[PDB]
Design a protein around this ligand. Sequence first.
Ligand SMILES: *[C@@H]1O[C@H](CO)[C@@H](O[C@@H]2O[C@H](CO)[C@@H](O[C@@H]3O[C@H](CO[C@H]4O[C@H](CO[C@H]5O[C@H](CO)[C@@H](O)[C@H](O)[C@@H]5O)[C@@H](O)[C@H](O[C@H]5O[C@H](CO)[C@@H](O)[C@H](O)[C@@H]5O)[C@@H]4O)[C@@H](O)[C@H](O[C@H]4O[C@H](CO)[C@@H](O)[C@H](O)[C@@H]4O[C@H]4O[C@H](CO)[C@@H](O)[C@H](O)[C@@H]4O[C@H]4O[C@H](CO)[C@@H](O)[C@H](O)[C@@H]4O)[C@@H]3O)[C@H](O)[C@H]2NC(C)=O)[C@H](O)[C@H]1NC(C)=O
Ligand SMILES: *[C@@H]1O[C@H](CO)[C@@H](O[C@@H]2O[C@H](CO)[C@@H](O[C@@H]3O[C@H](CO[C@H]4O[C@H](CO)[C@@H](O)[C@H](O[C@H]5O[C@H](CO)[C@@H](O)[C@H](O)[C@@H]5O)[C@@H]4O)[C@@H](O)[C@H](O[C@H]4O[C@H](CO)[C@@H](O)[C@H](O)[C@@H]4O[C@H]4O[C@H](CO)[C@@H](O)[C@H](O)[C@@H]4O)[C@@H]3O)[C@H](O)[C@H]2NC(C)=O)[C@H](O)[C@H]1NC(C)=O
Ligand code: NAG
Ligand code: NAG
Lengths: 195, 192
Amino acid sequence: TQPLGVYLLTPAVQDLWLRDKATFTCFVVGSDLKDAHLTWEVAGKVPTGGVEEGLLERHSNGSQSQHSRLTLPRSLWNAGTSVTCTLNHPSLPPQRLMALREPAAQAPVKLSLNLLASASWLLCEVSGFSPPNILLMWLEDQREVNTSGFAPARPRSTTFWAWSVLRVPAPQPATYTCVVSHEDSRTLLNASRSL
Amino acid sequence: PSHTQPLGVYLLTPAVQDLWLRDKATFTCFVVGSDLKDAHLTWEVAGKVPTGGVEEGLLERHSNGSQSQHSRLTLPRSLWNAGTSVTCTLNHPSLPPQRLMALREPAAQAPVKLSLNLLASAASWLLCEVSGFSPPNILLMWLEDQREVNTSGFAPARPTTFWAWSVLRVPATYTCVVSHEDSRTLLNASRS
Ligand SMILES: *[C@@H]1O[C@H](CO)[C@@H](O[C@@H]2O[C@H](CO)[C@@H](O[C@@H]3O[C@H](CO[C@H]4O[C@H](CO[C@H]5O[C@H](CO)[C@@H](O)[C@H](O)[C@@H]5O)[C@@H](O)[C@H](O[C@H]5O[C@H](CO)[C@@H](O)[C@H](O)[C@@H]5O)[C@@H]4O)[C@@H](O)[C@H](O[C@H]4O[C@H](CO)[C@@H](O)[C@H](O)[C@@H]4O[C@H]4O[C@H](CO)[C@@H](O)[C@H](O)[C@@H]4O[C@H]4O[C@H](CO)[C@@H](O)[C@H](O)[C@@H]4O)[C@@H]3O)[C@H](O)[C@H]2NC(C)=O)[C@H](O)[C@H]1NC(C)=O
Ligand SMILES: *[C@@H]1O[C@H](CO)[C@@H](O[C@@H]2O[C@H](CO)[C@@H](O[C@@H]3O[C@H](CO[C@H]4O[C@H](CO)[C@@H](O)[C@H](O[C@H]5O[C@H](CO)[C@@H](O)[C@H](O)[C@@H]5O)[C@@H]4O)[C@@H](O)[C@H](O[C@H]4O[C@H](CO)[C@@H](O)[C@H](O)[C@@H]4O[C@H]4O[C@H](CO)[C@@H](O)[C@H](O)[C@@H]4O)[C@@H]3O)[C@H](O)[C@H]2NC(C)=O)[C@H](O)[C@H]1NC(C)=O
Ligand SMILES: *[C@@H]1O[C@H](CO)[C@@H](O)[C@H](O)[C@H]1NC(C)=O
Ligand SMILES: *[C@@H]1O[C@H](CO)[C@@H](O)[C@H](O)[C@H]1NC(C)=O
């Protein structure tokens, strides 16, 4: 019998902020994915549209990968919609994965952006959220920036907190925006500070 | 007859903490697959078999039908520091020998120098700057006295050479240790 590893990837900040869309990616890794198929369910219904099945991929090591993508309007995401991918293979019982707003999940209360030194160093902080899985993005006049150093989420508390430092070269004035998406508590924070 | 299986071999290189705290360089080599009974991971140090220090691992079995087995080879830091060529090989009967090499690559620029200072100042914030190296594969570690502190924000390298930087947040002597694998180079700084 073949092993099958199926994963469900939640949408990234870039899709949710720059494109007003939430793209869920569900892919199975296997030895022979011919008759293994991925089905979708948005809030318990088969999707009307927005599903774009990927192509089967042979791999050098003998494994095979096939993926399927589902795109939701960001409104459905912030509302807490449930997305359920299913892996159906005739040799195995069905394997469902789910990305849903968790009742036990705390939204990130506050996001704080200020400056720390002068090349300028911009500090973005977000606190009061759980689970600790966090996604952060930096932007420079609606254009994405990557020169950042992100500190993963660290702990009296029920929550976690994280921060990322962005260093921008000393040069035109600019406004920097820090966007954070907590996925299990479908929040999308965003802040602007200017220099 | 018989049909072959998916077999994926991987090789981990020593970590900063391993070299800086223990003076030992452990190379973890493992293979992921379906039926790993006839899969034997073998080592070569400097191009010859190691006399000792190899810990073959039990066959891990995962909840998705995959099997995994890891063999690790621990070397003195001096051996790593010298540039000793480490090699892992997967020997399955119906498959070719698959070798993953952890060499000191000749074309690998080594980190020029390491910088450590204070970025800002309730808590305070440090910096660590590693400059002029390639490939960008690099590992960092902060230490409060002889104790590791994990409250850093690391910025991986972006583009002749590369440079990365890490900001540590502190609530002592703070040392930043840098490990560059391809040029078996290790650098530390210190501050107070
Ligand atoms: C069924 O499920 C099982 C369970 O997961 C699946 O098994 C997994 O299979 C995948 C196969 O792709 C493996 O991924 C590879 O992993 C290696 C290394 O893995 C290390 O890191 C993992 C993640 O660690 C982080 O997360 C964990 C949380 O789980 C956390 O605890 C940890 O602290 C850390 O934060 C570890 O999980 C893993 O530990 C496991 O294995 C240990 C050894 O066996 C064992 O001691 C542990 O107890 C544990 O069991 C391990 O520490 C990745 O390196 C590798 O990615 C390389 O390869 C891909 C190609 O696929 C490439 O795209 C990447 O860029 C990367 O390439 C590097 O390596 C190449 C050499 O192989 C080199 O040529 C490249 O240049 C690059 O090298 C760079 O870095 C290295 C540094 O070592 C340096 O040498 C180079 O110079 C250069 O700098 C894969 O991602 C999983 O590890 C494996 N999981 C387990 C638990 O075994 C199975 O696949 C599923 N089956 C199916 C059908 O789906
Ligand atoms: C033969 O070689 C192939 C190719 O290298 C191997 O295929 C790889 O298999 C591994 C095994 O799991 C896959 O790792 C998984 O990756 C998940 C996300 O991957 C994303 O990032 C990677 C790297 O950045 C990208 O390459 C991927 O993009 C590829 O796939 C998309 C979709 O098809 C394509 O569009 C792209 O072009 C690429 O082709 C992805 O973007 C990762 O989340 C996952 O980690 C979860 O699972 C492990 C268990 O293995 C947990 O330890 C871990 O904590 C995570 O678990 C949490 O998260 C998941 C959701 O992510 C939840 O479901 C869990 O419940 C839990 O919350 C895992 O690491 C790898 O993606 C895949 N590579 C490719 C290119 O397909 C074969 O394995 C190999 N065969 C053998 C036998 O060795
Ligand atoms: C980010 O968008 C939110 C909507 O939730 C809004 O309240 C806030 O003013 C925006 N941030 C900035 C800096 O404009
Ligand atoms: C790193 O630490 C060792 C031992 O503490 C010391 O000998 C060495 O001089 C340090 N590195 C530098 C660049 O001074």
